[PDB]
Amino acid sequence: GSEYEIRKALEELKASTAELKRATASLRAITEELKKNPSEDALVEHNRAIVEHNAIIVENNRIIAAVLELIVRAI
Amino acid sequence: GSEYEIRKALEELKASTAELKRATASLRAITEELKKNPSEDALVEHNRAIVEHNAIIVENNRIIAAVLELIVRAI
Amino acid sequence: GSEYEIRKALEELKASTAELKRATASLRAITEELKKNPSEDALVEHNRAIVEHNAIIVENNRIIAAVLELIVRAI
């Protein structure tokens, strides 16, 4: 069903958005610690954390694109 | 009204997109300065700027998700 | 045509998503190399790569916003 499939994808998007919100909270906390106590080791960890955060954004966009296709098929 | 609400959310998305465009312009400028004059202090500031930019993307995605829900209710 | 225009924009989104997938693959590879062999020179290159990746996300979001407007006009 078009309606059921769209809601399923929107629920996946909701879960991805919440995962992103949690990751943003962690990233902002280590950013404040980086500003207080900078070092090469801290920067490397911070860069790695940014990349993980970007990967969550990419998944969020992938789901958005899937919802758009389902909508276009429904209309 | 479904039509009015969707347009309101799209106007919020338009404003978020413009905020992101301005932030990208700033971020690219400090990236060119980082490449010219690297240092730990410059890297820490740059990492902090990336995180702020990512936070704007996250807000843009949040608005997109809200528009998708309004569309699904309208169809 | 509303249908043709939406499909054209979704094809542009598909191409942008694939560009992002390729960039993510590169970014993850240099992140693993950063963790193995950190240095200031490696960090500067990594920061520059993050910014390029973020610019692809921004373009993906721009296309998404354009698809949303076309959908709203079609419904």
Under 8 Å CB-to-CB from A1, ≥6 apart: which residues? none
Neighbours of B16 (CB within 10 A): 20
- Residue ranges of the domains in chain A? 2-74
Radius of gyration for the alpha carbons in chain B, expressed in angstroms and rounded: 17
Residue among C6, C60, C63, C64 with most chain B CBs within 10 A, to mutate: C64
Q: Which fold has domain B2-74?
A: Methane Monooxygenase Hydroxylase; Chain G, domain 1 (1.20.58)
Q: Is C66 exposed, middle or buried (CB count within 10 Å of its CB: 0-12, 13-18, 19+)?
A: middle
| CA nearest neighbour of A61 among C63, B46, C32, C36 | C63
Under 8 Å CB-to-CB from A10, ≥6 apart: which residues? A67, B65, B68, B69, B72
Contact C65 B35 (CB under 8 A): no
Q: Which residues of A touch B47 (CB under 8 A)?
A: 31, 34, 43, 46-47, 50
Contact B43 C44 (CB under 8 A): yes
DSSP C52: H
To 10 degrees, what angle do helices C40-74 and C2-36 make? 160
Q: Which residues of C touch A64 (CB under 8 A)?
A: 64
* Partner-chain residue, chosen from C44, C51, C72, that has the shortest CB–CB distance to B28: C51
To 10 degrees, what angle do helices C40-74 and B2-36 make? 160
d(CA A13, CA A24): 16
Q: Chain A: give the shortest CA distance to residue B48, in Å.
A: 6
* Partner-chain residue, chosen from A27, A57, A67, that has the shortest CB–CB distance to B68: A67
Under 8 Å CB-to-CB from B50, ≥6 apart: which residues? A50, B27, C47, C50, C51, C54
CA B62-B28-A43 angle, 5° bins: 80
Contact C51 B61 (CB under 8 A): no
Q: Chain A: give the shortest CA distance to residue B3, in Å.
A: 16
Three-class secondary structure of residue B37 per DSSP: coil
* Partner-chain residue, chosen from B31, B40, B71, that has the shortest CB–CB distance to C71: B71
Question: Which resolution in angstroms does this entry have?
Answer: 1.3
DSSP assignment string, A21-38? HHHHHHHHHHHHHHHHS-
